[PDB]
Homo-oligomer: A and B are copies of this chain.
Amino acid sequence: MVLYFIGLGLYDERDITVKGLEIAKKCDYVFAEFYTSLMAGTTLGRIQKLIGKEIRVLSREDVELNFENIVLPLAKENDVAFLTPGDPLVATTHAELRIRAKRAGVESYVIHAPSIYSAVGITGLHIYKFGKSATVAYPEGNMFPTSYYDVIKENAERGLHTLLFLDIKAEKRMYMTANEAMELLLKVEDMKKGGVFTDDTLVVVLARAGSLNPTIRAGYVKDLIREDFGDPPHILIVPGKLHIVEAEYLVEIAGAPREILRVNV
């Protein structure tokens, strides 16, 4: 009669909340999906061991096409949990699943967990200053769209930061690196010439947020584009106008060029 959407966290199996773990252990059946985001520090094995229950993994089709056929039926009679990386409902399509639950007469509750949206706070950039977010899609075709570049421009003009998720191809095990996002954006800049993403643009890279020692680096594209930020996942941020304290943290904590402290008030 109850379905619980439980977030697993960002890195490993301990990034789930105590509330999430306890509820999962009390559920008759436990499902999960691992295709929406990469959790670099754990496996299904470790997660299953932590919960002490076998977990039925669902594929993208299982979810998008047969969630109401696979999960909900059982949810009508028992307590069922559905696990996902990060925060359960931060994926554009996860929310709709709550609708299918309601319509099937199943009550649902959401158990939050660390998300990259809030975790970016560890970059020192003020969270309230972030504008619209976007994803740097993997280019497909000789000619491809670049709307994510327009989002950066739109935010930057308002002096707002831009969070950029980097595309992934789970089945192919392909995870776009910050380097690839930069290479790609520099090319878009030559084509659009908006002065939005140049060799001299200050950017911030956050790799493996959630782990104890993530890579946090800030600097000009020309300097970071060849830098190794470790294993994926990577996130790229294009800051808008910095507050002195933001810049202080980027210099002190992320190794940013000292000149960014001269924010030209």
Contact = CB atoms under 8 A, between A and B. Distances in A.
Interface of A: 7, 9-10, 12-19, 21-22, 50, 86-90, 92, 94-96, 98-99, 102-103, 109-110, 112-115, 117-119, 121-122, 124, 126-135, 154, 158, 160, 209-210, 212-213, 245, 248-249, 252-253
B112 A10 contact: yes
A95 B249 contact: yes
Task: Indicate how many identical chains form the complex.
Answer: 2
26 contacts: A7-B114, A9-B17, A12-B19, A14-B17, A14-B19, A14-B22, A15-B17, A15-B18, A17-B17, A87-B119, A90-B121, A92-B128, A94-B121, A95-B121, A95-B124, A98-B253, A99-B249, A99-B253, A102-B252, A103-B252, A112-B118, A115-B118, A117-B118, A130-B130, A131-B160, A132-B158
A99 B19 contact: no
Nearest to A252: B99
A50 B17 CA distance: 13
B131 A132 contact: yes
A139 to B, nearest CB: 20
A132 B95 CA distance: 22
Given A92-B245, A95-B121, A117-B118, 12 more contacts: A12-B19, A16-B17, A17-B113, A18-B18, A95-B122, A96-B245, A99-B249, A109-B212, A115-B117, A115-B118, A131-B131, A132-B160
Given A12-B19, A17-B15, A89-B121, A253 B102 contact: yes
Given A19-B14, A249-B96, A90 B118 contact: yes
Nearest to A88: B121
A57 B87 CA distance: 29
Contacts of A114: 7, 17, 87, 112-114
Nearest to A210: B112
A13 to B, nearest CB: 8
Contacts of A7: 114
A98 B253 CA distance: 8
Contacts of A118: 86-87, 90, 112, 115, 117-118
B89 A122 contact: yes
Contact of A133 (B9, B18, B121, B128): B128
A127 to B, nearest CB: 5
Contacts of A135: 128
Given A124-B95, A131-B132, A132-B160, A213 B17 contact: no
